[PDB]
Amino acid sequence: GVGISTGTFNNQTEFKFLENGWVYITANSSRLVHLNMPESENYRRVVVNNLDKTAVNGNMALDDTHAEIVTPWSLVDANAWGVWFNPGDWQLIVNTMSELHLVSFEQEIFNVVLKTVSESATQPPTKVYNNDLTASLMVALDSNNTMPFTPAAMRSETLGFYPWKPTIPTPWRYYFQWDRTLIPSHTGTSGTPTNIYHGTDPDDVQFYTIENSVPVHLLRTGDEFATGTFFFDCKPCRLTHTWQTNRALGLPPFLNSLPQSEGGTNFGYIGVQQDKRRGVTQMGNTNYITEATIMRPAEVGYSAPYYSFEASTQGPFKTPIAAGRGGAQTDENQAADGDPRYAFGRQHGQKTTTTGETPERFTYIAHQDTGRYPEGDWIQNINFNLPVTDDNVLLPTDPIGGKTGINYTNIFNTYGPLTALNNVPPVYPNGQIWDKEFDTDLKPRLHVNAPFVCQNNCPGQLFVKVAPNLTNQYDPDASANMSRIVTYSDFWWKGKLVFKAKLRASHTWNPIQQMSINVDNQFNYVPSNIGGMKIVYEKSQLAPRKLY
Amino acid sequence: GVGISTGTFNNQTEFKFLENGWVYITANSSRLVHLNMPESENYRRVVVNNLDKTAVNGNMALDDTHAEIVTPWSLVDANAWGVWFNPGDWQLIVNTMSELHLVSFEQEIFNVVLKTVSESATQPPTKVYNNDLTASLMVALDSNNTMPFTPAAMRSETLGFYPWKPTIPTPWRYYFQWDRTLIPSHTGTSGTPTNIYHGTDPDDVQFYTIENSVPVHLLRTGDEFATGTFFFDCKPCRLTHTWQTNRALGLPPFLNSLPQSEGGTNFGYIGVQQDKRRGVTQMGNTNYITEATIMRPAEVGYSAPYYSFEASTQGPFKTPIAAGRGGAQTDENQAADGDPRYAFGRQHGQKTTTTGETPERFTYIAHQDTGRYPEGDWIQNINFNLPVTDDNVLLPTDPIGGKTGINYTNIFNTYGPLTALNNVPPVYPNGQIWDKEFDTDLKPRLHVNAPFVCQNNCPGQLFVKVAPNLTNQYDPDASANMSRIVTYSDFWWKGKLVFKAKLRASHTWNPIQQMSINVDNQFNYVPSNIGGMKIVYEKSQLAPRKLY
Amino acid sequence: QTVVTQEPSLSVSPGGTVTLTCGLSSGSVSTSNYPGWYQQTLGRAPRTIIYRTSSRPSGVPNRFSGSISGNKAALTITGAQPEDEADYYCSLYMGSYTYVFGSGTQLTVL
Amino acid sequence: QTVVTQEPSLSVSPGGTVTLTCGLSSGSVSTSNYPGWYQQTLGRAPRTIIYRTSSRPSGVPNRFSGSISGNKAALTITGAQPEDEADYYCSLYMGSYTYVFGSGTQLTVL
Amino acid sequence: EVQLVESGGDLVKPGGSLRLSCVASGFTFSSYNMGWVRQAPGKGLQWVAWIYGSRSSTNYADAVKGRFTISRDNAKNTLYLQMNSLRAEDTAVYYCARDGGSPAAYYGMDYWGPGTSLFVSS
Amino acid sequence: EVQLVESGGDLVKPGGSLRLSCVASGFTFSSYNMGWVRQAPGKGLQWVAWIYGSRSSTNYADAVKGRFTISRDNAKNTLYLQMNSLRAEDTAVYYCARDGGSPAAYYGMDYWGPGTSLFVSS
């Protein structure tokens, strides 16, 4: 009814420990969600065009041309790690657990409140807010996944990460098909590169509406909505990283001479000439057996063209890579391709008291060593006459195409049947948790944006809207915009995310890396004197595991 | 038989996780123990006397005068944390667990080998080692605890901490009663202070022998000995520290004015005059209610005379304290009374390749804040007229007894019915695990050397000896020493220590302190290029818990 | 010790083409040396003309071109202007993280 | 500003008793000031005579005694020897971690 | 945009020490390898020191090894060159140098400061 | 046993900088609070700087605040006094001072070094 609550606030994470080292981690997340009535009650097909920016030669990477259907609905998205765990919970998970499973998801809307705003004609602004007890909130659960999948974490538009801070839903929109051509150029190109937007292909048109595709529930102040429990079928997520490169696979060479005194200058020596050694190599025309030429079971990681942009029907897009750059751990400035960069606002980890539109940014460096150091790569002749001469070796400094800033590694691909790689680690708090699998016939082996992928399906998107609150002067025949009473809603969203995790075991004599609070990061986890909070990112795959 | 093994080497720690967040931690420890035949086959009553050292005025703290029975037996002691856990196991325990229980203990001796040494008459030394298949090893388990309790961890004489490094037992001895008087002096005292050893009281004589008190088993090469499982009845051991001082107990004062801008210079203010405030204080003659005078439920910690030496029948001994010094965490140089200092050799954590008799030493600073900062203490008149004048206040800088280096805090005791304190934390790897309770009528509330105390009893001490290997010329009537064939033994000792522990829970938004490997301590856990190992100490009570 | 040799002095008429060369007494200059060319006027700090043997910083006129000729680095000024008269210094990346600088060439526009 | 005042010059006959005093222009000297007394000879570094107002370092003759007299620190030399003629400096601990030094007293043994 | 300003150059007697400070603006200071070059009066440019990487690894020319120390403070966006046991041969104008390639270094001085003169004379 | 040796004192022009280094031996350097005192030519002793605690907290006299920096390296058992913007009033003999009370400081100079002379003159 009007004066009866329809739900309870719960934001507790429970760790129920099972037998055999397994734990059920049920994270509860409760938020107060504020929603305004849509700017327009219609669906719009809006073409965003920034040909001015890309008309500058060399700016083709800044292309934003696209077409989107803007809908009157808003999306309630909780597909981010920060929506579910605080730094203490994440510390417990990443320190005491070795693998993580995604078990189930539930969400519900309760304690719906709808208020109308009456603004007076007095010259200084003044307004009052009245409860509209008969107003309704339109809630649609796309449990069949009919609507396009538009996760908000990629735009930093999920629910807020603070239980005590009210959050908002994101206005929903989806991509409409378009055709676009953009010939790349550079500073110094003469003429106007081909840069046109060709329109839309009629055979690819797909105009979706929530009304025609999903059942819609009208919730009054005394109503509540529950989606029901959804159960995932994803793969386990490892909370351990691998450190072994191809150089550290298998049996090391026997050292016939060992150091007689400790110290950094004292080295063990194999004691056998490199061309007189025993072993197996894939180089059938050389007698040298070294750490770089000896046979290994397979290849850890792969090389791909980095900062390569491929053009397709809808324009250019960067070629993704599964693994981050090698050497970003020895030198943090080397983080670039494959090291995801997260930019977020005050709702999602940035200092809440900051002013301005500049977001808080961080580049994530994974502990796994599956990356590549292209500056140390090279190609050489099949003859393999050592030491190699100039014409028989292609080095990373050799120009490709006549460009001194482009080398073969930029266009180099080593993906093959022997490539072995890991899934992307969870990124806390701004990383996505689960992502829908592509509906293609042949599917990618992994996604670079979420550690869990939906093989069959994952829970339907939740859409909310303020039902039209018409005045007495509504005329559907009029071409002017619908006249509505200014209405807004505040409702409580509660979600339950259930994981299954395995407790880690100590395999080595030495201790391992753990996340800990210290003097440097001590104040990143507590509020300031005025209430300013923040959530800094945390690494997940802290403990190491042996690859081979 | 001769060619049949009687046991298996096991040095694995198993973490079997139970329901409700409990885990059984069974640590297995296997060692190769080398034992030489005793220097003498007799019991000796030896008086150690160093009156020369203490005859120097001011050196009374260096008194070593005592009397001990030296026995032909050796003690096998595994009552140290390093005997059971490696740094990885300890990291897991201290990071993932909140409390620890001592469940059970087992030990056994197997694969007994006895060898005789034949030394040739050739001028350059040369010798051979022959198996004495009929020789015996005498093993006595004092399961009834008849013999004096002499834990070896206090002398750094337990078994080695490395599974792959053979260890030795410690020759066993116990204290014999003696009377000693030593009048304290100082540099500048005139005359010879009273310094005598008065002998032994006949009413306190207690001469123990293993033969007359314990059953003795004769183990040949094909024999093994098992003590059987012993079960403890000790109290739980907390793996969390308390941070709350009396200044942080209860409801804080309400701040009527809060800072309007974040920054270290912006403070909240109570907004009420200290003499106009409301609350409860134990000072019935003052209207001031402040953070230092407001009533608290009880007292956390206590003050005691530090570096006070009490003399008794057998001489002077330092007065122990339960808690360490306050401020040793803000300034590591303040560690002194109550902060245990451990000195150990190469068997028990010191770099195994070091040379010399200098031991490796470390002072343990506990994370618990139950200590005292005597420099901030003071006494003042009951009148309590503020600001206090010279004659109405006794400060830590005021001489006591006319000595400018002694103040009231040196003789100050605040232990009372309101005192609340914690048990001593485990010290890894050199700390003792369990200790026998005193047989007095009134027993101490805790022990400062081990976190677990034996209420009724704890497992009997294990004594080993090489059975006499006589030559053909033995004559018991001769007053000369017994002539024996030079014999020694090597046997494998295996022990199982079972703990019950509770997994910790995340109670706060922020993360907590965890033990982690880093660049600074990275090489403290791995061998050097020549095999040099070490075991640095680790703190146990890392996570905090609320006292009130 | 590494020594970088370049013409001590060079001349060019206005609107002409001139080439300044930078070699090594022992060895050859390649793109692995990342030859850099910097321009310095009297009483002023050096100005970067070329980096990575071909890249001129934004604002550098196109008349300056960097290349690798033979076993040396070459800086070619085509249509040299009066303001191009200055001391041009060549920097070679000698591996590891060591840099070497040439003696410098004083280019005067007639 | 804290100012430590002590007698600029003092004299004592051999075998006699002399007292050097160290006070504060504003305030009084107590054991909380940890008065220290240091002896300096011509062309030599200072030598610590007294610390904590009563403690003389090992090797300091017993004829040097530190005390608190009235509202000042006192260094008494009894049976003064010829080698005691030197500049005696007084140090006061001014709270927190601030130290102040007196002007110094030139003690000459007649 | 990218600006480097050097300071601390002053007349100093032989055998002394001096710290040159380079303030950088218009770019992320910590993301670029920095260095110090020097030009003697009437002589050509000579590389002095280089600081590179997130670990602040340092390399020095043979003429200043053991005597010069190159460091950086990214909080202040400052580069410090501390010279000890200064000689008459160290008298010169010292230029701040910034490499423009953060993830792929140009291995050449992308930006230069105005320079600070240091005179060593008895 | 306990020995302190100061070095680095040299003639320097006004406005310059100089680092005095104090090497300590015969005791655990990190366990004792250290300091720098100074005596002007013909003047009395004046406290300059103090370093105390395991956290290396530093305090300075008003005459040298902002200009002097006191630091310590326990690995080298060394105490560093870096003076910047040296004035003619800074000309004096600087003495290393060691407090003998590790857990209970004497709050007085227990041990002194021979001292190093610093002359500031144009």
Question: Which are the contacts of A128, defined by CB distance < 8 A and separation ≥ 6?
Answer: A117, A118, A120
Q: Are strands C105-109 and C9-12 parallel, antiparallel or unpaired?
A: parallel
User: Is it the case that chain E and chain F have 3 or more CB pairs lying under 8 Å apart?
Assistant: yes
Q: CA of A78: how far to CAs of A31, A82, A135, A342, A496, in Å?
A: 10, 9, 26, 17, 10
Cβ neighbours of D98 in F, within 8 Å: 47, 50, 59, 61
> CB contact, 8 Å: D51 with chain F?
yes
Buried b / exposed e along A151-161 (16+ C-beta atoms within 10 A): bbbeebbbbbb
Cβ neighbours of B19 in A, within 8 Å: 17-19
| A73 token code pair | 């609905």
What resolution in angstrom units was achieved for this structure? 2.7
Q: Is the dihedral of CA B382, B387, B389, B393 positive or negative?
A: positive
- Burial class (CB within 10 angstroms; exposed 0-12, middle 13-18, buried 19+) of C35: buried
Chain B residues touching chain D at CB-CB below 8 Å: 187-188, 390, 395, 397-399, 403-405
Q: Distance of alpha carbon A224 from its chain centroid, rounded?
A: 31
Q: How far apart are CA F77 and CA A168, in angstroms?
A: 59
Question: Which are the contacts of E19, defined by CB distance < 8 A and separation ≥ 6?
Answer: E8, E80, E81, E82, E83, F17
Residue C87 belongs to what H/E stretch? strand C86-93
**Which of A378, A389, A404 best probes binding to C when mutated, by most C CB atoms within 10 angstroms?**
A404
> CB contact, 8 Å: C58 with chain A?
yes
Cβ neighbours of D34 in F, within 8 Å: 106-108
- The nearest CA of chain F is from the CA of B327 a distance in Å of 10
Longest dimension (CA), chain B: 97
Q: CA of A205: how far to CAs of A68, A176, A189, in Å?
A: 12, 7, 36
Q: CA of B391: how far to CAs of A332, B288, B385, B531, F22, in Å?
A: 63, 21, 12, 65, 43
Q: How many residues does chain B have?
A: 548
Cβ neighbours of A408 in C, within 8 Å: none
Closest among D78, D88, D83, D68 to D20, alpha carbons compared: D88
Buried b / exposed e along B93-103 (16+ C-beta atoms within 10 A): bbbbbbbbbbb
Of C31, C34, C54, the CB nearest to A398: C31
Of A325, A332, A336, the CB nearest to E54: A332
> CB contact, 8 Å: F12 with chain D?
no
Contact E17 F15 (CB under 8 A): no
Q: Torsions phi, psi of A349, nearest 5? A: 120, -20
Q: CA of B449: how far to CAs of B155, B230, B346, B539, in Å?
A: 12, 21, 21, 15
Q: At what angle do helices A87-96 and B87-96 cross, to 10 degrees?
A: 150
Buried b / exposed e along E32-50 (16+ C-beta atoms within 10 A): bbbbbbbbeeeebbbbbbb
- The nearest CA of chain C is from the CA of E44 a distance in Å of 6
- The nearest CA of chain A is from the CA of B328 a distance in Å of 17
Strand partners, C108: C11
Cβ neighbours of B262 in A, within 8 Å: 353, 528-530, 532
Count CA atoms within 13 Å of residue B263 on its CB side.
5
Contact D32 B395 (CB under 8 A): yes
Q: CA of B110: how far to CAs of B170, B209, B217, B468, in Å?
A: 19, 25, 13, 20
| F14 token code pair | 């006004």
Q: Residue B313 carries which side chain, given as an amino acid letter?
A: T
Cβ neighbours of E15 in F, within 8 Å: 10
3-class SS of residue B3:
coil
Of A95, A261, A528, the CB nearest to B530: A261
Q: Torsions phi, psi of B349, nearest 5? A: 120, -20
Contact E18 F19 (CB under 8 A): no
Q: How far apart are CA D48 and CA D60, in angstroms?
A: 8
Q: Are strands F116-120 and F57-60 parallel, antiparallel or unpaired?
A: unpaired
Q: Residue B5 carries which side chain, given as an amino acid letter?
A: S
Count CA atoms within 13 Å of residue B446 on its CB side.
17
Buried b / exposed e along A114-135 (16+ C-beta atoms within 10 A): bebeeeeeeeeeeeeeeebeeb
Give the start-end residues of each E strand in D1-110. Answer: 4-6, 9-12, 17-24, 36-40, 47-50, 64-69, 72-78, 86-93, 99-101, 105-109
Rounded to 10 degrees, the C-alpha dihedral B454/B460/B464/B467 comes to 150
One-character DSSP codes across B68-93: EEEEEEEEE---SGGGT--HHHHHHH
> CB contact, 8 Å: E13 with chain F?
yes
Report the 10 Å Cβ neighbour count for A263. 10
Q: What is the DSSP letter of D49?
A: E
Cβ neighbours of C32 in A, within 8 Å: 395, 397
Contact C58 A187 (CB under 8 A): yes
| A156 token code pair | 């930093």
Contact B261 A96 (CB under 8 A): no
Closest among A317, A316, A339, A345 to A326, alpha carbons compared: A339
> CB contact, 8 Å: B399 with chain F?
no
Closest among B245, B376, B373 to B298, alpha carbons compared: B245
Q: Are strands A22-36 and A179-182 parallel, antiparallel or unpaired?
A: unpaired
Q: How far apart are CA E59 and CA B136, in angstroms?
A: 68
Residue of chain E whose alpha carbon sits nearest to that of F18: E17
Q: CA of B467: how far to CAs of B44, B133, B216, in Å?
A: 18, 13, 11
| D102 token code pair | 């007196």
Q: How far apart are CA B226 and CA A13, in angstroms?
A: 47
Cβ neighbours of F62 in D, within 8 Å: 1
Whole-number CA gyration radius for chain D:
13
B414 neighbors B303 (Cβ within 8 angstroms): yes
Contact A90 B511 (CB under 8 A): yes
| D6 token code pair | 């002590």
Q: How was this structure determined?
A: cryo-EM
One-character DSSP codes across A219-271: E-TT--EE---EE-----EE-EEE---GGGSSPPPP-SB--SS-STT---B--
Closest among D97, D89, D96, D87 to D73, alpha carbons compared: D89
Strand partners, C100: C92
Of A87, A262, A511, the CB nearest to B511: A87
| B239 token code pair | 């793996």
Strand partners, B67: B47, B176
Q: Is the dihedral of CA B513, B519, B522, B523 positive or negative?
A: negative
Question: Which are the contacts of A475, defined by CB distance < 8 A and separation ≥ 6?
Answer: none
B535 neighbors B161 (Cβ within 8 angstroms): yes
Contact B336 F103 (CB under 8 A): yes
Q: How far apart are CA B53 and CA B182, in angstroms?
A: 12
Q: CA of A115: how far to CAs of A75, A170, B369, in Å?
A: 20, 20, 53
Contact D45 F106 (CB under 8 A): no
D100 neighbors D92 (Cβ within 8 angstroms): yes
Of D52, D58, D62, the CB nearest to B404: D52
Cβ neighbours of F18 in E, within 8 Å: 16-17
Cβ neighbours of A403 in C, within 8 Å: 54
Residue A94 belongs to what H/E stretch? helix A87-96
Q: How far apart are CA A69 and CA A47, in angstroms?
A: 9
Report the 10 Å Cβ neighbour count for F47. 23
Q: Distance of alpha carbon A345 from its chain centroid, rounded?
A: 15
Report the 10 Å Cβ neighbour count for A100. 22
Contact F18 E17 (CB under 8 A): yes
Q: Torsions phi, psi of B315, nearest 5? A: 120, -165
- The nearest CA of chain A is from the CA of C30 a distance in Å of 9
Rounded to 10 degrees, the C-alpha dihedral B445/B450/B453/B457 comes to -140
Q: Torsions phi, psi of A94, nearest 5? A: -75, -20
Q: How far apart are CA B270 and CA B257, in angstroms?
A: 7
Q: How far apart are CA D14 and CA D21, in angstroms?
A: 20
Q: CA of C54: how far to CAs of A58, C84, D68, in Å?
A: 17, 18, 81
Report the 10 Å Cβ neighbour count for A51. 14
Q: How far apart are CA A385 and CA A395, in angstroms?
A: 16
Count CA atoms within 13 Å of residue B235 on its CB side.
15
Q: CA of F98: how far to CAs of B335, D110, F40, F49, in Å?
A: 19, 33, 20, 12
| A37 token code pair | 């009535």
Residue of chain B whose alpha carbon sits nearest to that of D34: B397
B153 neighbors B77 (Cβ within 8 angstroms): yes
Q: How far apart are CA A379 and CA B541, in angstroms?
A: 55
Cβ neighbours of B512 in A, within 8 Å: 88, 91, 516-517
> CB contact, 8 Å: F13 with chain E?
yes
Q: How far apart are CA B104 and CA B496, in angstroms?
A: 8
User: Is it the case that chain D and chain A have 3 or more CB pairs lying under 8 Å apart?
Assistant: no
Closest among B120, B118, B116, B125 to B37, alpha carbons compared: B116
Q: Residue B306 carries which side chain, given as an amino acid letter?
A: Y
Q: How far apart are CA B192 and CA B52, in angstroms?
A: 12
3-class SS of residue B522:
helix
F59 neighbors D98 (Cβ within 8 angstroms): yes
Residue of chain D whose alpha carbon sits nearest to that of F38: D101
Report the 10 Å Cβ neighbour count for C96. 8
Cβ neighbours of F11 in E, within 8 Å: 13
Q: Distance of alpha carbon B368 from its chain centroid, rounded?
A: 17
Of C38, C45, C93, the CB nearest to E107: C93
Cβ neighbours of A406 in E, within 8 Å: none
Q: Residue A247 carries which side chain, given as an amino acid letter?
A: R
Q: How far apart are CA A94 and CA A71, in angstroms?
A: 39
A66 neighbors A178 (Cβ within 8 angstroms): yes
**Which of B331, B404, B406 best probes binding to D when mutated, by most D CB atoms within 10 angstroms?**
B404
Contact B404 D58 (CB under 8 A): no
Contact B335 F55 (CB under 8 A): no
| B133 token code pair | 């298949």
Q: How far apart are CA A349 and CA A360, in angstroms?
A: 8
